[PDB]
Amino acid sequence: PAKIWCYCRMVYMPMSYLYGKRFVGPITPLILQLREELHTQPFHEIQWRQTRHRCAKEDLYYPHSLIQDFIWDSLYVASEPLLTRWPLNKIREKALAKAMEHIHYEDENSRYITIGCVEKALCMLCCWVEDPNSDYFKKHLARIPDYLWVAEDGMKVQSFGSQLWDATFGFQALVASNLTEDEVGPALAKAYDFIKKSQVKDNPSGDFESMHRHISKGSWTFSDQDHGWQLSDCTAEALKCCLLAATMPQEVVGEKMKPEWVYEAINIILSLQSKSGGLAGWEPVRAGEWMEILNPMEFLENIVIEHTYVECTGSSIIAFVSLKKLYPGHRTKDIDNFIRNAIRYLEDVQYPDGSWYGNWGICFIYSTMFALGGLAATGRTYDNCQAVRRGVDFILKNQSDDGGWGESYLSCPRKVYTPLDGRRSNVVQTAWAMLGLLYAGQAERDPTPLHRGAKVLINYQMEDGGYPQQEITGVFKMNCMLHYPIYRNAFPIWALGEYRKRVPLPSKG
Amino acid sequence: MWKLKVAERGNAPYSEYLYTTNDFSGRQTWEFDPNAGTPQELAKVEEARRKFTEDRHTVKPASDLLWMMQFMREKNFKQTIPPVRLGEEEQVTYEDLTTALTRTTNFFTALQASDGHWPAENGGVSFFLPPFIFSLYITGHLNSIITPEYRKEILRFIYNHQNEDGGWGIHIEGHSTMFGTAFSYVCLRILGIEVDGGKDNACARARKWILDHGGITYMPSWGKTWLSILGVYDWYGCNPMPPEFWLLPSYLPIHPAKIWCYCRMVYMPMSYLYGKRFVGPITPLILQLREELHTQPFHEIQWRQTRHRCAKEDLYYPHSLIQDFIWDSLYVASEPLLTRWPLNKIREKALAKAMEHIHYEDENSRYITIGCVEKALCMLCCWVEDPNSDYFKKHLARIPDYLWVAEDGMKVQSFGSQLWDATFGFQALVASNLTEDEVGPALAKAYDFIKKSQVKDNPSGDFESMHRHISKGSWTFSDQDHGWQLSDCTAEALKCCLLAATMPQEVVGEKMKPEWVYEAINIILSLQSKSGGLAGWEPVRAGEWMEILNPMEFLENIVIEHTYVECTGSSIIAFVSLKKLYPGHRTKDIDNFIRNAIRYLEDVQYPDGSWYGNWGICFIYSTMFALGGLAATGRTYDNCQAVRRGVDFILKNQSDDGGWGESYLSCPRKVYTPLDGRRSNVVQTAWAMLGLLYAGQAERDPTPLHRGAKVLINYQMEDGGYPQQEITGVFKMNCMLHYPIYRNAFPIWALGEYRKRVPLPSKG
Ligand SMILES: CCCCCCCCO[C@@H]1O[C@H](CO)[C@@H](O)[C@H](O)[C@H]1O
Numbered sequence A: 001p002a003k004i005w006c007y008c009r010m011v012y013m014p015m016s017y018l019y020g021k022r023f024v025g026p027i028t029p030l031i032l033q034l035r036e037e038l039h040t041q042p043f044h045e046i047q048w049r050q051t052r053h054r055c056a057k058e059d060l061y062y063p064h065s066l067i068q069d070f071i072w073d074s075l076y077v078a079s080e081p082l083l084t085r086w087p088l089n090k091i092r093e094k095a096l097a098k099a100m101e102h103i104h105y106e107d108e109n110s111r112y113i114t115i116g117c118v119e120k121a122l123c124m125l126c127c128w129v130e131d132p133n134s135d136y137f138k139k140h141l142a143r144i145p146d147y148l149w150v151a152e153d154g155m156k157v158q159s160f161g162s163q164l165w166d167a168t169f170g171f172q173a174l175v176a177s178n179l180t181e182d183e184v185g186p187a188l189a190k191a192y193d194f195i196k197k198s199q200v201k202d203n204p205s206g207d208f209e210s211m212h213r214h215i216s217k218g219s220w221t222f223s224d225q226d227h228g229w230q231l232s233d234c235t236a237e238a239l240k241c242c243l244l245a246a247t248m249p250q251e252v253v254g255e256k257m258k259p260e261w262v263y264e265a266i267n268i269i270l271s272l273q274s275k276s277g278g279l280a281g282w283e284p285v286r287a288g289e290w291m292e293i294l295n296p297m298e299f300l301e302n303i304v305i306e307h308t309y310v311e312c313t314g315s316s317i318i319a320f321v322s323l324k325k326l327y328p329g330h331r332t333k334d335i336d337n338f339i340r341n342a343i344r345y346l347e348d349v350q351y352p353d354g355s356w357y358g359n360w361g362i363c364f365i366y367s368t369m370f371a372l373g374g375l376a377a378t379g380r381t382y383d384n385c386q387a388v389r390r391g392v393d394f395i396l397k398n399q400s401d402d403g404g405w406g407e408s409y410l411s412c413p414r415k416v417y418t419p420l421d422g423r424r425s426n427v428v429q430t431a432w433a434m435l436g437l438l439y440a441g442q443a444e445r446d447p448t449p450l451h452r453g454a455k456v457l458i459n460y461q462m463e464d465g466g467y468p469q470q471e472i473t474g475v476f477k478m479n480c481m482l483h484y485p486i487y488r489n490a491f492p493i494w495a496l497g498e499y500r501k502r503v504p505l506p507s508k509g
Numbered sequence B: 001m002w003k004l005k006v007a008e009r010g011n012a013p014y015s016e017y018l019y020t021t022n023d024f025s026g027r028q029t030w031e032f033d034p035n036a037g038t039p040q041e042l043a044k045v046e047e048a049r050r051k052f053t054e055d056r057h058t059v060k061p062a063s064d065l066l067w068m069m070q071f072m073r074e075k076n077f078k079q080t081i082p083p084v085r086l087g088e089e090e091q092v093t094y095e096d097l098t099t100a101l102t103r104t105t106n107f108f109t110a111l112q113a114s115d116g117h118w119p120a121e122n123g124g125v126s127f128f129l130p131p132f133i134f135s136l137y138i139t140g141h142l143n144s145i146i147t148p149e150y151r152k153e154i155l156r157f158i159y160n161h162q163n164e165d166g167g168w169g170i171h172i173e174g175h176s177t178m179f180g181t182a183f184s185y186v187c188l189r190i191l192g193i194e195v196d197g198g199k200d201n202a203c204a205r206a207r208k209w210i211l212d213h214g215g216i217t218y219m220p221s222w223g224k225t226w227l228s229i230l231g232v233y234d235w236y237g238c239n240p241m242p243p244e245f246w247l248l249p250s251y252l253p254i255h256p257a258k259i260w261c262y263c264r265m266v267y268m269p270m271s272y273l274y275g276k277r278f279v280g281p282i283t284p285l286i287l288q289l290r291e292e293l294h295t296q297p298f299h300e301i302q303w304r305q306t307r308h309r310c311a312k313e314d315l316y317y318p319h320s321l322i323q324d325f326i327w328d329s330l331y332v333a334s335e336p337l338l339t340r341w342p343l344n345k346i347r348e349k350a351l352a353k354a355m356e357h358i359h360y361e362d363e364n365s366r367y368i369t370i371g372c373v374e375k376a377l378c379m380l381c382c383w384v385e386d387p388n389s390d391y392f393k394k395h396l397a398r399i400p401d402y403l404w405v406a407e408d409g410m411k412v413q414s415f416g417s418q419l420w421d422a423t424f425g426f427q428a429l430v431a432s433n434l435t436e437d438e439v440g441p442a443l444a445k446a447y448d449f450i451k452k453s454q455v456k457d458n459p460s461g462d463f464e465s466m467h468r469h470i471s472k473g474s475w476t477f478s479d480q481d482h483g484w485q486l487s488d489c490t491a492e493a494l495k496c497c498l499l500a501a502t503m504p505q506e507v508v509g510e511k512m513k514p515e516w517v518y519e520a521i522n523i524i525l526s527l528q529s530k531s532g533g534l535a536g537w538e539p540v541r542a543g544e545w546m547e548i549l550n551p552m553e554f555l556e557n558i559v560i561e562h563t564y565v566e567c568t569g570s571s572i573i574a575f576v577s578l579k580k581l582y583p584g585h586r587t588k589d590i591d592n593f594i595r596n597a598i599r600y601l602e603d604v605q606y607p608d609g610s611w612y613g614n615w616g617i618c619f620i621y622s623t624m625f626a627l628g629g630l631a632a633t634g635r636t637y638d639n640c641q642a643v644r645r646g647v648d649f650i651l652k653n654q655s656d657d658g659g660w661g662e663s664y665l666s667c668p669r670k671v672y673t674p675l676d677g678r679r680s681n682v683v684q685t686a687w688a689m690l691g692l693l694y695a696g697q698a699e700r701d702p703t704p705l706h707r708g709a710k711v712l713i714n715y716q717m718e719d720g721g722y723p724q725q726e727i728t729g730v731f732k733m734n735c736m737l738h739y740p741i742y743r744n745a746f747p748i749w750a751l752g753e754y755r756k757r758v759p760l761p762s763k764g
């Protein structure tokens, strides 16, 4: 269990307990009258041993391997005839007790706001079937209304919080944009104090070490401080925000953080790193890529084991480069080595077409922006450099009739980069492309394409404010999708803030 | 008193009469004449021996000079042309290049053209000869087969290349290995030579290196398995390899029809030997030699916990945790069961199936099976079953087909390479301009041999559904007597045939029928992967996760095959060349295959602008083939994807005079270290020039090409050829190979197209 991914470990463990207990819910009169219409054959007059392997051709993304199917088939006859009529009392009871105590130790440290709606829902049943009358069940029931949400359509369910990530992105956009009226100072302070208060500093309760978990010291979460989960992606943006706000005057933004807490964040970031370059999100490395053969699901990919993410590597390298300007005072001979290790990783992930796709945003250029931002930091030029011109040429070759950029939700799963969505464009994707191209120093090279890129943004501006474009603009594990409501405004303002700073574009009137 | 002569002895050559397929089409044999002698020519042998003995440190390999010496009397050309030398950036004209070609081509084509090819050699690594010595010692025919005059030659071969530090190498240019050192010491000691401490008899020197490395328990699994048969090691100290893997309905994920052919044909005799638990007789030499080797008493040590002790010098691919756990579980699953209470039915059926599979395989292979080690092990496998038979005698009869002699002592040739080198030489000759036009008879005398070298008959018996692939009009790497499909040689053979097809009939002779090429095209199209490219023997079996079960630790990617870039480039250039002659077979399929293969080449490219190969030791060896296969589909240079990367990589890396060089350790480390003293080699420079030429850089900027051509004329010998001696070959990223004719085949090929591409006008 100390080898598999954290999400799979915390999801399948309640599944393991439920399978071991063979728990079946009460058969209400609705169940008996509804179980007949679903199945095309009679409910109890069918077979089940040979019906286990029937995969649909519509929901099949990663088919099972021969070895995996053979292992499951062997285990079916190894376990069911044994641990159902003559169950090993000692082994099964110890396994159930260990699962129960692990779930109890995990939920207490997670403050009952555990990762995933499905995982929390399954854990609620797992703890209810053990003791319907307790306090853990009541506290789990109390945090249920923390996930429901309302929109233009009916009520929906929010998988997890994202206030910290969007707040950091908005703060970075605001500070990058020129303070014209300078009245954003109070809002910047009222967000900075919240950001400071959002830092997770306490260790998980109990013996977190040697319990299939990693050490957390001054780390950041993705949802809120109440969770207490280390994630290198959000920490890299938080450190950049803190460093950029550090140089701002004290009299305008307020007090500043102590310079000793950043060392813990640097140590945590350096803790997560692979042997060939880059870093993962939660754990550095467990095993090889051959562990994915045992994937139970068929509509996802790369779930059992983690992998290195290019966006996190780019954010970490740009954060480390930004730190050098302020003060070099911690492991001068180690940060340079880490940067050298990370530099060669970015070149490997590049595809021959000149672009490499990400893992969270639905685009072949979403990770390109972060890579270009993290590549120009180490002095990578454009006239004479390796792999820098490939992304620029890829971006230039692919545009709309008016210079816009667009893709489709099926582009990433097929890994083909199909932009045929009607030759349309979106504000978020165009802003991402412009920001990525800006880090390459193309403003002084040839800003003529940038003129239409900026002009295709002003028309989409609403008189009431904001941009009315509505798209998911997010992917999850190459099959699932995600939506962000503030990306419509956060990124265009960020791009327009640096558009004037890079190229003055003089015009008296 | 050694004369090199074609065999022509199909009726009882040494001990048993054998059967040929095309009247000994290229059979290689060597005989020690009893009455040969010359007052002055025989004196050259001592000079050849002493030159290598004194320049072993500076030059590790040795080109075959005594072999080509014998052909100087048979063809007394006596040509006198000084080596043309140009300096101070003087532009060369057609005259100097034509003179150099006239001097370096006539003797090359007169070296050997009677049969239709040139005798080539592999790379002497001193790795598979101790198996032959052990086999001959265990069969009792060592005295009958190995004459005493061969003993001094093999002793000199062993002594000529020995590391002064004590630790030998896996290949000729190795450094501080345990397998090679131990095997060489055992083979030298078992042939009746005592223990001394001199420079010639360096047993005492090797004692210090053997003893200070934890005995002989740090050698790889092959060494332990081999010494367990000779009464030196114990079966409990190695890993279990049950012979029951061949009993399955071929539905399990691991079946013999899934693993590579070489591994399947090598480990099967190992499986039989492990199942039978056969141990050779303990001669008085064995008991007196088993004590000095081990640092502890022979029988007073443990073996169950000594199975996992890997040396830090001969470790390239460490074992995985799952593999070690599987072996540990199998050790207690099989040994307590199938040793004291063996399953009679299962074990007997497994042994019978292994025996019948070996017998069916050797008959179809004409007893010239792949690999010296595999043949040596199969000889023991068939001898322990029936010491008095005909298969054993016929195996014993083909033993002298592998021994070879060079400037150093007698060596062993792993496999034949006459067809590959003959095709390369023919391609070079036809690409070079026919100045005197007298190469026509030699071209015909090689073309008829090439036509006769085609394998057309199916393997005897039910070759299909026997873990083998269909062969129809295929080509082998060694000779037609083998009958093994290989897409690499077929691609070059088809190009040679197509290029010779457009030549006039009156000058080269008759031509092949246009119906046989369809079978070759079908065979080539049969081998292809689902993502692009193709393998050598089988299209695809499983994924890349099968390599976790690798038993060896000094190699990599042995259990399963892989796609080779060089073969893909050769196939695509052959297919493009075929379109010019006549499109008449699957017009909608060849284009699809080319489209599939095009995208494969882009993927294998490294970010540095170059991708290394698998057979030549260079990061640019595969680059030449890729560039040759990429410019065929209209890939330009000014505006194209990935074409400029290789050109920039080649331009950025040069010598002080524009030369190119690498090191044997560059490919294993995948770093492309050229720091060999900033030197260069003729073969590598010719490869680089040929690869750059396909990119159309002759009209772009031929200024770098001037020095690239000039650094070649100086290396030209007045007697002909180039004296540079390097292996210029790699095998599975750890082993090395040598080619003796690459010194001449490639420079002439480059010079032939140098004048054709850029005229370089100069009136005088
Ligand atoms: C200490 C040794 C106890 C011997 C078996 C106890 C009697 C049966 O006990 C049961 O046996 C079944 C099959 O083994 C399983 O259900 C469990 O082992 C156990 O509950």
Ligand SMILES: CCCCCCCCO[C@@H]1O[C@H](CO)[C@@H](O)[C@H](O)[C@H]1O
Residues within 6 Å of the ligand: B340, B341, B342, B343, B344
């Ligand atoms: C149908 C079962 C017959 C007996 C199987 C015993 C377990 C297999 O084991 C083998 O069986 C041989 C034949 O009995 C015996 O020589 C030994 O028990 C053992 O070698």
